[PDB]
Design a protein around this ligand. Structure first.
Ligand SMILES: Cc1ccc(NC(=O)C2(c3ccc4c(c3)OC(F)(F)O4)CC2)nc1-c1cccc(C(=O)O)c1
Length: 1134
């Protein structure tokens, strides 16, 4: 079934079976169903059970459950089977320069060249398949662990689950979703790196005769210093972290109230604030970047000293042959690479991996839910001596009841009086330590908060069972659902989405009652499912199935109805956490008559980026001119010396490629600084261009999809991309310079190197298309896992009460396998690309070596000493190219935002008002006309409730609107919008208060006098409500102005409107928002001190706006008018 079960060994080895998708992924787009099936052994269901067997074996064998030592018997052995291969692959790398250091002798060298080419072939065979298998073991680990974690998630008691932090689960799972899988190509370097040195410091001793340690000590100094830079980096990034949240909260707030900023004309204030916050964040990030450059440059200036200090003493004491320079250097590369990068990566990998395993081990131990011994045999359900604590706080006062197998009881009380907790106990999700609460235990549930799964109506109303036509017909016609079935689009199999928004409250309640009464259980706990259906609909359902079809059997509802509780064979009414009274229906309805009566990626992007900043041109030109002149200088000195000991000890500089062309401290820093300044410029201009997009465009961009263009891309553009571009330039420069040096020594390397560089570039272009497409596919394949996780958590109570855990286990396993296919395929194709790269390098080396040998002393030494160890930096250059082309996507999406357009007396007149949300949608008005009168209101009533938001907002020119407005002699044409939208003054239903001090949250432009502000505050009815604040007035209104209440915030907004001398006050929702005392305050303020602003009070109920003088009546698509109540409540309203 898979593509791997049919393949030759050679094809499984050189990754030939991945050819057809590459044969496909080049020419055309991939269709999601083109992804080959998973190999059988990687099926989640075939691994989770295996891992669980060993896990609970570790649990039941000892009382120190080291999960890692339950893994050590699952995968460990194949782990060794790949570790030994990797060890051999690295010993080959270490020992090859010895077979290099014999052919400098010159006959007897060609044979060693053949052997060395075979050494390259051995390395390129033993590395890549072993690394791929290791990554495969990593993927198996991740899948098995996720399956166990999920399967466990549906076993937690509720006492601990409602106490876990909602973000803990998502962070825990997603943390090791990509990292941990690749965190096994670097595990064996905990005992590879040591064996390499205890090998190397043998051979080098055999060469130096006294001086081994003198270089290892330098490497220890260097590595310790470089790691010490780690904390001096992390401290800066820590200090920046919370500061990023401080910058981000105001951006989120602004994004979430954009139409307020547009109406108040505050664009410049927000821009200035965002700048003044970002300044110091850039300060810290720039410091961090300089430190990180020092870090990455220490590794590049190692390669010279690591050999100069190891060569200096023995050279001093005795003259050294030249063979012991070109040879030792080729060891010095490996040793450096095996104590500075390979070791700390292994150490960090084990830290992080064992930390994550510690976390998961500490997870699986948590308190485990148990399903009670039910459905064995039982008569009438009995709940005797029931005492339960909502956290010793008694939600139940030792209650008891016997409910007959067929009878009917009804609970009632205050909302959440613990009767819900009493059911969640009788439902077995809360454990009361008192008494005996038990039943037959075959119970169905219908919770107050319905959940909607993914699938058709038959699915959410079956939950994994057959469909009986009589049962479905009775339910639908009974649950007010035969209409709800038929009325739908396809009417029987609507392919539903998630969230439940596709239906209303009534449809959702019908669906929940259906899922409840679907199958027959010895009890039906319907926790007030009749609370979202209409009263007549409630009576319909009660007469239909609630009190008709499931009443002939046992049932225990929880309802607060005055009519329903009458007909139940028992009643239990509770207050103050205890039953006020209860008993039989007649006895309860009589035992308290008073109480009973009371209760009821293009080169456009590259060039654009590189030329956003006229200093980047200069930095690149300088960096390249210095590189070119340095190549020329080293080449001329090489020729001069090629055609006192310092003469021949010069060779140690050119003889190492790295330090020749490594970015000096006077050239590598300004590039890193310039990139960060480019990030600032781009961020500022994106902000400027998202504060002026026309509002009929922003509407398309859903609100969650703009903040992520700030908190994600700009973070990348600050931290990641500058370093990656720096490393790419450094590595490409090194490679090209070394290849130039190799070329000039004899001019046959050039004409062979051209059809090798062409091959590299062609292969890279042939691969990246498929790699990027498969990356994207994996990206959208990751989402349904978390969707299913959310759906599982939300409906856990009902899920467990049904008893349908395995079905969802299988569904989650399906989603897992569906992601696993894409991941496995991407991994395999990446490794194929690496193999082809290294093989092409190997043929290039065959060419260089044989051409050089078959045609001096320093010539051969330098040629070979570069063409041997350039491969590592070449592979880094290729991987860095991949990473930079990946990271440029953020720049591309940023430029997407960069390209949006800018938006554009008291008496007045209005005509021809065309308005809609989109360009040409539903006409908000049809040539609406009116007169705006002097010094008196114009009430907006009539069809108030058909939407006054359209005309109200379009009066501020903040919708897809155009037409005719003429205010006091001026029109909507001449004056600038930023000076026209300020004449009108909004009084929004949701007042905006920036997270800052009062002087800035009320007068953000800061053009007022503090005494003027004090006067405008006191006279506007806020002095009292502002006297109770910290300090005097500088209170930082943190967390969205939580302290103030609707009345105080409304008065503040009113003062902010009174500030700029607004000549129109379109106040909306007077009584809905204001409290009663606050309503009196607002009325007495606006009528008295806002006396002569031509307000338009637009409230739905006519009783709120009947007071105003005129009435510009409201009516859909035609704004009729009755100038006075002499016809208003007689013609428009009647
Ligand atoms: C005693 C022993 C035997 C074998 C192993 N190897 C493993 O099990 C495997 C593994 C697991 C997680 C990893 C990892 C490698 O590499 C990583 F990616 F970094 O994370 C299957 C290879 N490990 C140990 C061991 C080590 C350290 C501590 C303990 C302990 O009992 O505390 C036990």
């Amino acid at each position: 079934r898979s593509p791997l079960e049919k393949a030759s060994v050679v094809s499984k080895l050189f990754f030939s079976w991945t050819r057809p998708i590459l044969r496909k992924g080049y020419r055309q787009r991939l269709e999601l169903s083109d992804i080959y099936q998973i190999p059988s052994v990687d099926s989640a269901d075939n691994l989770s059970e295996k891992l669980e067997r060993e896990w609970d074996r570790e649990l039941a064998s000892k009382k120190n459950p080291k999960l890692i030592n339950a893994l050590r018997r699952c995968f460990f052995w194949r782990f060794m089977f790949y570790g030994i291969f990797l060890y051999l692959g690295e010993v080959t790398k270490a020992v090859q320069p010895l077979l290099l250091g014999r052919i400098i002798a010159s006959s007897i060298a060609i044979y060693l060249g053949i052997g060395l080419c075979l050494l390259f072939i051995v390395r390129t065979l033993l590395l890549h398949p072993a690394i791929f298998g290791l990554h495969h073991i990593g993927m198996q680990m991740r899948i098995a662990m996720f399956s166990l974690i999920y399967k466990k998630t549906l076993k937690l008691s509720s006492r601990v689950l409602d106490k876990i932090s909602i973000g803990q689960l998502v962070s825990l799972l997603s943390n090791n979703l990509n990292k941990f899988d690749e965190g096994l190509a670097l595990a064996h370097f905990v005992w590879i790196a040591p064996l390499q040195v205890a090998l190397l410091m043998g051979l080098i001793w055999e060469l130096l005769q006294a001086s081994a340690f003198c270089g290892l000590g330098f490497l220890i100094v260097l590595a310790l210093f470089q790691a010490g830079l780690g904390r001096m980096m992390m401290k800066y990034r820590d200090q920046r972290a919370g500061k990023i949240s401080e910058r981000l909260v105001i951006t989120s707030e602004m994004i979430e109230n954009i139409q307020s900023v547009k109406a108040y004309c505050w664009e410049e204030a927000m821009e200035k604030m965002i700048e003044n916050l970002r300044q110091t964040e850039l300060k810290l990030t720039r410091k961090a970047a300089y430190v990180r450059y020092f870090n990455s440059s220490a590794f590049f200036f190692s390669g010279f000293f690591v050999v100069f200090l190891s060569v200096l003493p023995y050279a001093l004491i005795k003259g050294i042959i030249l063979r012991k320079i070109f040879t030792t250097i080729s060891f010095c590369i490996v040793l450096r690479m095996a104590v500075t990068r390979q070791f700390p990566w292994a150490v960090q990998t084990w830290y992080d991996s064992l930390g994550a395993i510690n976390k998961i081990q500490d997870f699986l131990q948590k308190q485990e839910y148990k399903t009670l011994e039910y459905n064995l045999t039982t008569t009438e359900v009995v709940m005797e001596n029931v005492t339960a604590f909502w956290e010793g706080t008694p939600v139940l006062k030792d209650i008891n009841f016997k409910i007959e197998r067929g009878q009917l009881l009804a609970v009632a009380g205050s909302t959440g009086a613990g009767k819900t907790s009493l059911l969640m106990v009788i439902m077995g999700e809360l454990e009361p330590s008192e008494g005996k609460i038990k039943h037959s235990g075959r119970i169905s549930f219908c919770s107050q908060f319905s959940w909607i799964m993914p699938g058709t109506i038959k699915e959410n109303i079956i939950f994994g069972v057959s469909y009986d036509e009589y049962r479905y017909r009775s339910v639908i016609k009974a649950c007010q659902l035969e209409e709800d079935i038929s009325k739908f689009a396809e009417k029987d199999n609507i392919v539903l989405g998630e969230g439940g928004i596709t239906l209303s409250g009534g449809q959702r309640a019908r669906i929940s009652l259906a899922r409840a009464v679907y199958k027959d259980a010895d009890l039906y706990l319907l926790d007030s499912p009749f609370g979202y259906l209409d009263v007549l609909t409630e009576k319909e359902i009660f007469e239909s199935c609630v009190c008709k079809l499931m009443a002939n059997k046992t049932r225990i509802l929880v309802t607060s109805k005055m009519e329903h509780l009458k007909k139940a064979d028992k009643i239990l009414i509770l207050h103050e956490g205890s039953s006020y009274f209860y008993g039989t229906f007649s006895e309860l309805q009589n035992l308290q008559p008073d109480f009973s009566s009371k209760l009821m990626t293009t080169w456009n992007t590259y060039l654009r980026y590189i030329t956003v900043h006229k200093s980047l041109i200069f930095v690149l030109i300088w960096c390249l001119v210095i590189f070119l002149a340095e190549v020329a200088a080293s080449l001329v000195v090489l020729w001069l010396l090629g055609n006192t000991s310092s003469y021949y000890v010069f060779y140690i500089y050119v003889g190492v490629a790295d330090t020749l062309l490594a970015m000096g401290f006077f050239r590598g820093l300004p590039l890193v600084h310039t990139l960060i300044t480019v990030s600032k410029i781009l961020h500022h201009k994106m902000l400027h261009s998202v504060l002026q997009a026309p509002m009929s465009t922003l509407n398309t961009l859903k609100a969650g999809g703009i903040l992520n263009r700030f908190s994600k891309d700009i973070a990348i553009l600050d931290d990641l991309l500058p370093l990656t571009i720096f490393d790419f330039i450094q590595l490409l420069l090194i490679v090209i310079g070394a290849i130039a040096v190799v070329a000039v020594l004899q001019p046959y390397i050039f004409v062979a190197t051209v059809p090798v560089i062409v091959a590299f570039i062609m292969l890279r272009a042939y691969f990246l298309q498929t790699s990027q497409q498969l990356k994207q596919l994996e990206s959208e394949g990751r989402s349904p896992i978390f969707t299913h996780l959310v759906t599982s958590l939300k409906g856990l109570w009902t899920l467990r009460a049904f008893g349908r855990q395995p079905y969802f286990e299988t569904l989650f396993h399906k989603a897992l396998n569906l992601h696993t296919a894409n991941w496995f395929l991407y991994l395999s194709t990446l490794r194929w690309f690496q193999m082809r790269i290294e093989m092409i390098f190997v043929i290039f080396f065959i060419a260089v070596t044989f051409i050089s040998i078959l045609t001096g002393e320093g010539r051969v030494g330098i040629i070979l000493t570069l063409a041997m160890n350039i491969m590592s930096t070449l592979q880094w250059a290729v991987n860095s190219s991949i990473d930079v082309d990946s990271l440029m996507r953020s720049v591309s999406r940023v430029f997407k935002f960069i390209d949006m357009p800018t938006e554009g007396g008291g008496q007045m007149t209005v005509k021809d008002l065309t308005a809609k949300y989109t360009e040409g949608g539903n006409a908000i008005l049809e040539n609406i006309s009116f007169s705006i009168s002097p010094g008196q209101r114009v009430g907006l009533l009539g069809r108030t409730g058909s939407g006054k938001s359209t005309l109200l907002s379009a009066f501020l020119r903040l919708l897809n609107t155009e037409g005719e407005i003429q205010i006091d002699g001026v029109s909507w044409d001449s004056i600038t919008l930023q000076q026209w939208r300020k004449a009108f003054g909004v009084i929004p239903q949701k007042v905006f208060i920036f997270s800052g001090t009062f002087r800035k949250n009320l007068d953000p432009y800061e053009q007022w006098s503090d005494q003027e502000i004090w006067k405008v505050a006191d006279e506007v009815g806020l002095r009292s409500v502002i006297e109770q604040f910290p300090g005097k007035l500088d209170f930082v209104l943190v967390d969205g102005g939580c302290v103030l209440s609707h009345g105080h915030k409304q008065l503040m907004c009113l003062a902010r409107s009174v500030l700029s001398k607004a000549k129109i006050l379109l106040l909306d929702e007077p009584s809905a928002h204001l409290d009663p005392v606050t309503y009196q305050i607002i009325r007495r303020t606006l009528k008295q001190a806002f006396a002569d602003c031509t307000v338009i009070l637009c409230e739905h109920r006519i009783e709120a706006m009947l007071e105003c003088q005129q009435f510009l009546v409201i009516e859909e698509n035609k704004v009729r008018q009755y100038d006075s109540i002499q016809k208003l409540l007689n013609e428009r309203s009647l």
